[PDB]
């Protein structure tokens, strides 16, 4: 019986290390997003076309807005299959905090530190917005880290509804950039390679699958790419 005591304390042990952790979440604010809301190439999510908007939601996390900042589930089933297939599922948010507070180092300590700074914005920041921060916070495939920052640049086109200047935003267009999120640098949005031209397809089809698009407007999005 003395045996399950120690387990106590090594738990317990963990569990003050986990502690501590919190104890540093501190010192960084949550207060970037709204500065980050101000940029060289700017844009909010409720004012672009939906579509856009599910062209990474459906990809990075199905149900996004349906998870409280945190998908417990489909993470542990992400850090369960990275291990075994190297190949989501840490959903929109945190992906934000990491590029937010710490580009430069990856660590499981980071991973940790990560997660208090995602309850801090779920209870600081509306889930669309979030979401836009997101999208003007990323590395595309040039030197662009906002979603319009790449859009004038690769299809001289625009991520607003509302935009009468630079031609729409096309699906077809969308679904790279749900690639891109990831995409540098082996994979580049000028030549692309042979199973890079395989995943758009794979996410636009949840865009479909999740009906962020209705029929029609899939096969426009899956001829015009193989030309």
């Not at 850090?79 to 075994?84: D, G, H, M, P, V």
């Not at 995602?118 to 979603?147: C, M, P, W």
Request: cysteine-free; aromatic content about 12%.
């Amino acid at each position: 019986r003395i045996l399950l005591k120690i387990l106590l304390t090594i738990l317990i042990i963990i569990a003050l290390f986990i502690g501590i952790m919190y104890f540093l979440s501190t010192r960084d604010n949550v207060d970037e997003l709204r500065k980050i809301e101000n940029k060289s190439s700017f844009v909010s999510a409720d004012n672009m076309p939906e579509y856009v908007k599910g062209a990474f939601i459906s990809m990075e996390d199905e149900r996004f807005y349906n998870h409280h900042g945190f998908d417990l589930k489909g993470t542990t089933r992400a850090l369960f299959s990275t291990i075994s297939d190297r190949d989501g599922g840490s959903t929109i948010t945190q992906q934000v905090v990491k590029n937010y507070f710490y580009d430069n180092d990856r660590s499981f300590t980071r991973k940790v530190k990560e997660l208090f700074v995602a309850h801090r914005v779920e209870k600081q920041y509306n889930k669309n917005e979030i979401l836009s921060f997101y999208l003007n916070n990323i590395y595309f495939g040039d030197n662009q880290y906002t979603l319009e920052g790449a859009a004038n640049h690769y299809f001289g086109t625009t991520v607003n509804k509302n935009s009468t200047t630079m031609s729409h935003i096309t699906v077809l267009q969308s679904a790279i950039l749900a690639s891109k999120v990831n995409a540098p640098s082996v994979y580049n949005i000028n030549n692309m390679s042979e199973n890079f031209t395989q995943r758009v397809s794979t996410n636009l089809e949840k865009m479909k699958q999740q009906n962020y698009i209705n029929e029609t407007q899939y096969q426009q999005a899956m001829s015009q790419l193989n030309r």
